[PDB]
Subunit: 86 residues, 3 copies
Amino acid sequence: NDKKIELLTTYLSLYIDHHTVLADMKYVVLDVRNAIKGAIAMPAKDLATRIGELDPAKTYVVYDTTLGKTALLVLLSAGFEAYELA
Amino acid sequence: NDKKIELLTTYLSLYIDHHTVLADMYVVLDVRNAKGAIAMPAKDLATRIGELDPAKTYVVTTLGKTALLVLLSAGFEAYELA
Amino acid sequence: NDKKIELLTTYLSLYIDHHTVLADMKYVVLDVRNQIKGAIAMPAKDLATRIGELDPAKTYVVYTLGKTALLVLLSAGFEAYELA
């Protein structure tokens, strides 16, 4: 039953534990909702067009579904290192 | 990240924009076993598969998933309301 | 649509009937969060530490957190399901 394990392993590696961002509050949070402190507002429907103003050196964390995922997918496809806030 | 992108890409291909459905009004399916749609419970979706038109695009927790799987296995082009 | 069916088939195989669990009442439910009568409290942050107490013959039902627990159980060889 390597499928479940493989699926869960990859599903989980998409999230950043609240306890991990905990040690940083390196990380740049990104609220991608539809208009938490230290959160640079930036809806997913715009994240693409505004992907230039993002510093690849910092790891991105997005929180809200599908909104988070899409935004997460944009970042990871672009090559950035990103996670979704658990 | 190929594995993440591969999982996020396929996961998201399962949903359809909630704004896109209302726009069109696609044949929505209230698959809850407990507006302007069709009551198509999951536990009864398989048995009532006949009623389904193999030319329309259907839009449907674990029940939503199950129903979609049923629709897609059957060969229908379905999606879950995001 | 093969990828989709492949993903749902495996995603769905991770859950267990909510009716079956109470129905059996070979299932040992586990409250992993840090309620449901009969559920054995066991935080996910401790599951990996108490993976020896579990009976390899009993089927486990876990009540991201719920998933991490499942992953621990399955990886160790235990047969587990997430309570749907």
